[PDB]
Amino acid sequence: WGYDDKNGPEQWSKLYPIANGNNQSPVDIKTSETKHDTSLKPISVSYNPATAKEIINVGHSFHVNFEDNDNRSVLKGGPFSDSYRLFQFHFHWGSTNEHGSEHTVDGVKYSAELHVAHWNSAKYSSLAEAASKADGLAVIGVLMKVGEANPKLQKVLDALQAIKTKGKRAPFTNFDPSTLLPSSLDFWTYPGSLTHPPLYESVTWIICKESISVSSEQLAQFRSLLSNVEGDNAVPMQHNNRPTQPLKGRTVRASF
């Protein structure tokens, strides 16, 4: 699978029928249809920069992985009674500034999106066990609006020159990804999925109402990452955002 016209989001249903499921992501958050839920606690992140491990070119994107052997790095609060363990973050972006986010708010497309991914370590003993369970994953989504250069993005963007081609990886250490999160953690939450194969309906989405900035040049650095292996013809990673999917009667809740 990929984001080509041949192996792309429109085609994914052929090998992953769950792509047409009832809890697919991302979605368009219509603010007129959200339900304020008084029972939602604030989101609490506490991440240890020593859990930062490795940055990997996975062909369609790049992932920053964290050591997840204990609860040094955790998400709590929001709609959760369980503590969720940080295991990675990544970005989605588009071919132009005009699109690039996965989630949209009242039809508005942002330029990119940050995903900070966590697994239910109160209930399950590994990511591999949790990854397919309804309550297994918690992912913070942060819409990224084109404007001023984001200096917190800096260590991440500086590391891409070492992982230019598919399968390259490099140490990436001493980093707290809570430094990328907006000042306000007022959020929307809905039950949904991974936004690429295998599209498991295992994610409680936490979508921040506040955006973060990214420059046109910072976005170009993402699109300059290559999906080919070293030695082959260079194929830029131009986009990796899935279209929004039908809510099919799910409710998006607002903490605010």
Ligand SMILES: O=C([SeH])c1ccccc1
């Ligand atoms: O959240 C999404 Se999209 C996801 C993809 C790979 C690993 C973890 C989460």
Ligand SMILES: [Zn+2]
């Ligand atoms: Zn993602």
